[PDB]
Design a protein around this ligand. Structure first.
Ligand SMILES: O=C(COP(=O)(O)O)[C@@H](O)[C@H](O)COP(=O)(O)O
Ligand SMILES: [Mg+2]
Length: 226
């Protein structure tokens, strides 16, 4: 029925994108460039997953300061800032997530992360939100540049499934975004979508369930869809 649950990270485990946006903007300020992404701009840029990819897209169009460093270096600084901001301890898990995970663990169900985000962010979020290193919560962590093409490419889900050794028909993905749903479906997975601030405007055609809150699953029971 379900032998594994695969979780997206940003927008799914926790509402994190405003902290990402802060970490980007503060990094840009610290580099002495005039770049600044407000919510309207960030909503658009969020359709490109991966922070390096997002910076690259922004730089193709923007008419402010030229990049002073390679994008990888800008993004590495932004990651360090995000890890630091996460440690402060303001971020909570989305409703239903903590209970679902604890319930899955009691039931012996294997858990993965499949995310476009940088690996240190996963670690930082798990310390802050669960109080544990990521590998104590998730049996498999597929993140960041572990694949060459990010969501909507299914590669990150295919990596996670290969490491889980669970066929997709015995697993399910939880996502918040359209590119996430596309990726999970591309790996042959049932996908439960609950959007947030930045993704509620999207069309979720093909989602197995579209929910206002992951608490609406009622835990493990709600996962085993047709
Ligand atoms: O598109 C993304 C969504 O992550 P998820 O797949 O977990 O929803 C990421 O790029 C984050 O916006 C920022 O994280 P990085 O800057 O580390 O890429
Ligand atoms: Mg997400």
């Amino acid at each position: 029925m379900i032998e594994a649950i695969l979780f997206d990270v940003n927008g799914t485990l926790a509402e994190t994108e405003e902290l990402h946006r802060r970490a980007f903007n503060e990094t840009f300020a610290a580099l002495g460039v005039d770049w600044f992404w407000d919510r309207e701009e960030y909503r658009e840029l969020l359709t490109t997953t991966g922070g390096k990819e997002r910076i690259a897209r922004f730089l193709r169009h923007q008419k402010g300061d030229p990049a002073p460093l390679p994008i990888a270096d800008i993004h590495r600084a932004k990651t360090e800032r995000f890890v630091a901001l996460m440690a402060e301890g303001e971020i909570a898990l989305r409703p239903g997530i903590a209970d679902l995970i604890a319930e899955a663990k009691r039931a012996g169900i294997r858990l993965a992360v499949a995310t476009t985000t940088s690996l240190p962010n996963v670690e930082a979020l798990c310390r802050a939100c669960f109080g544990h290193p990521a590998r104590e919560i998730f049996d498999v962590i597929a993140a960041g540049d572990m694949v060459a093409e990010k969501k909507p490419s299914p590669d990150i889900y295919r990596l996670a499934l290969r490491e889980l050794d669970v066929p997709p028909e015995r697993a399910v993905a939880l996502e918040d975004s359209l590119n996430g749903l596309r990726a999970a479906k591309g790996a042959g997975l049932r996908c439960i979508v609950s959007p947030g601030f930045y993704t509620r405007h999207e069309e979720f055609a093909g989602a197995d369930r579209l929910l206002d809150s992951f608490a609406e699953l009622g835990g493990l029971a709600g996962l085993d869809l047709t």
